Structure 1
Amino acid sequence: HISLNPDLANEDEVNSCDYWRHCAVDGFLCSCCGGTTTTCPPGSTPSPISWIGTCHNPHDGKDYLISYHDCCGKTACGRCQCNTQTRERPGYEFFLHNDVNWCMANENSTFHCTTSVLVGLA
């Protein structure tokens, strides 16, 4: 199932804001920043917390929970900026909200890039 496995897919597809699992990304895709969809670029630190999105997979027709962990403690990657907002909500639904820095509780809160970790079926 290539649709569930970004490392097997075309890099150009995964590095697009239109890639299905990036449906609530407000930030730079870590896969364009020397990392991958599920690994921080070298010398940047995963956030223990995240906003969560529910994204539809058009390939297998199912909906998945996505956790948008950031990588932190390096300055802005600047590449592949996305601002997608499917099912995103304001700060009174805080863990569905993406206008805050999810590096906010890291040892260093400087925002580097954001990614889309597949948690499971919605």
Structure 2
Amino acid sequence: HISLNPDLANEDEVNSCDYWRHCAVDGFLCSCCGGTTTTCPPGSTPSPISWIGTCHNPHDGKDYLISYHDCCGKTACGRCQCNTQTRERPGYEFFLHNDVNWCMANENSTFHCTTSVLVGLAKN
């Protein structure tokens, strides 16, 4: 349970690039930017689109689908920059790719930070 609920967990843990659900983040962790893992910092707008990663949970041993939605429309947060690439693939598998700005379709495409939204267990 606690492994799946970052708001209860240690902030130093969730604000680390090694936190299990941040396994394909290329950008600033929103939880270090005045937001949380699932809420944009005030005045930044969620992206409707994202890259997706599957990350291994070290507690329950299961793999989970993570949607790396960005928060957009504010200039770069600059804090907790990560560049993790587990299962990341190039732009010919576009929704697995994290070298593009997933704010690209927002009303304002300026990239602020990246979130790590837990969708559920990897599909089976």
TM-score category (smaller protein) = over 0.9
SS of the residue 1:68 aligns to: strand
Q: Distance in 1 between matches of 2:18 and 2:32?
A: 14
Partner SS state of residue 93, structure 2:
helix
- Describe the SS at the equivalent of 2:68: strand
Q: CA deviation at 1:10?
A: 0.2
Structure 2's unaligned 5+ residue stretches are none
Question: What's the offset of the Cα at 1:107?
Answer: 0.1
- TM-score for the superposition, normalised by structure 1: 1.00
Deviations 1:57-96 (Å, cap 9, x if unpaired)? 0011100000000000000000000000000000000000
RMSD: 0.2
TM-score by length of 2: 0.98
Tell me, what secondary structure is at the counterpart of 1:24?
Answer: coil
Q: Distance in 2 between matches of 1:77 and 1:7?
A: 20
Compute the displacement of 1:113 (Å): 0.1
Partner residue in 2 for 1:84: 84
* Alpha-carbon distance, 1:44 to partner: 0.1
Aligned length: 122
Q: Deviations over 1:7-51 (max 9, x none)?
A: 010000000000000000000000000000000000000000000
Runs ≥4 residues deviating over 6 A: none
Per the TM alignment, residue 6 of structure 1 is displaced from its structure 2 partner at its CA by 0.1
Identity %, equivalent residues: 100
Q: 1:10 and 2:16 equivalent?
A: no
Gapped regions of structure 1 (runs ≥ 5) = none
Structure 2: distance between partners of 1:10 and 1:58? 16
Task: Tell me which residue corresponds to 2:113.
Answer: 113
Give the secondary structure class of the aligned counterpart of 1:21: helix
| CA–CA separation in structure 2 for the residues paired with 1:2 and 1:14 | 12
* Alpha-carbon distance between aligned partners in 2 of 1:109 and 1:62, rounded to the nearest angstrom: 34
Q: By how many angstroms is 1:5 displaced?
A: 0.2
**Alignment correspondent of 1:32:** 32
